[PDB]
């Protein structure tokens, strides 16, 4: 049973990436999986199922939809937008949102209203996560972990400055873990990276990803 998110939940998964990126001392246990979900939502359900079946994997495709979950947090009833994921519980998703809202309020207290580039909903959050995945893929092509961190601190210096939760060591470990545990994600990531690196222009981060991905050959 593999979750195959479609184009419709790409905005949601990007926001989930962003919520972890704004979290001070964020727990990156699920970042490898969330990053992979973002890549699949970019490829689309159709292409994702095609890649897995072509790679010889047998797949039970799980539809990914946005649902509203009502949960009581500190006496107050709260509405949370969650994704129907077999790989990621409602509880985990909500706790990611709770912890990021705590970090966000601390940011308001520090600098007032937050600039677009410092928010959890900045359009490049998913790609920022996938830049670490691109570095891990190079070193798999866990000894190369120190080199991933050192290459990450230089290439993602502006992004690390923007996001308190951009912790290269934790994110790289999460990707190493997911690629070891679920090797079918390597095939998904590689097809994602080939397709992405063909797109012209776009954002600074889309450009950094393309350069990092191209480096896995030369
Ligand atoms: O500027 C604000 O007061 C603002 C904006 C949003 C939103 O875009 O939903 N939110 C909700 C929100 C804030 C932080 C967070 F990590 C998750 C959700 N707060």
State the resolution, in angstroms.
3.0
CB atoms within 10 A of CB 150: 12
CA gap 125, 19 in Å, rounded = 9
Distance CA 163, CA 108 (A): 14
Give the C-alpha separation, 134 to 104, whole Å.
28
Ligand 1 atom 13: the closest Cα is on which residue?
Answer: 101
* Ligand 1 center from residue 207 Cα (angstroms): 27
Q: Which atom of ligand 1 is nearest to the CA of 15?
A: 17
Probe target for ligand 1 pocket from 26, 68, 101, 165, with the most ligand atoms within 8 Å of CB = 101
Method underlying the structure: X-ray
Query: What is d(CA 166, CA 42) in angstroms, rounded to the nearest whole number?
Result: 21
Q: Any idea of the CA torsion for 12, 155, 100, 3, to the nearest 10 degrees?
A: 30
- Please tell me the distance between residue 104's alpha carbon and the centre of ligand 1 in angstroms: 8
- SS3 of the chain: the string is CEECCCHHHHHHHHHHHHHHHCCCCCCCCCHHHHHHHHHHHHHCHHHHHHHHHHCCCCCCEECCCEEEEEEEECCEEEEEEEECCCCCCHHHHHHHHHHHHHHHHHHHHHHCCCCHHHCCCCCCHHHHHHHHHHHHHHHHCCCCHHHHHHHHHHHCHHHHHHCCCCCHHHHHHHHHHHHHHCCHHHHHHHHHHHHHCCCCCCCHHHHHHHHHHHCCCC
Domains of the chain, residue spans: 1-218
Residues 10, 172: Cα–Cα separation, whole Å: 22
């Amino acid at each position: 049973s593999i979750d195959t998110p479609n184009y419709d939940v790409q905005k949601h998964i990007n926001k989930l990436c962003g919520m972890l990126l704004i979290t001070e001392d964020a727990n990156h246990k699920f970042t490898g999986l969330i990053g992979m979900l973002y890549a699949m939502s970019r490829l689309g359900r159709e292409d994702t199922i095609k890649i897995l079946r072509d790679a010889g994997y047998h797949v039970k495709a799980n539809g990914v939809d946005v649902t509203t979950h009502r949960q009581d947090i500190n006496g107050k009833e709260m509405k949370f937008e969650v994704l129907t994921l077999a790989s990621l519980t409602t509880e985990i998703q909500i706790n990611i949102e709770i912890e990021s809202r705590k970090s966000y309020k601390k940011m308001l207290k520090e600098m007032g209203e937050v600039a677009p580039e410092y928010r959890h909903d900045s359009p490049d959050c998913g790609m920022i996560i996938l830049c670490i995945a691109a570095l891990v893929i190079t070193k798999l092509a866990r000894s190369g972990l120190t080199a991933v961190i050192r290459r990450a601190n230089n290439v993602l210096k502006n992004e690390m400055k923007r996001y308190k939760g951009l912790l290269p060591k934790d994110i790289a470990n999460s990707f190493y873990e997911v690629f070891e545990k679920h090797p079918h994600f390597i095939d998904v990531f590689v097809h994602f990276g080939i397709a992405q690196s063909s797109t012209r222009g776009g954002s600074r981060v889309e450009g950094i990803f393309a350069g990092l991905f191209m480096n896995a050959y030369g």
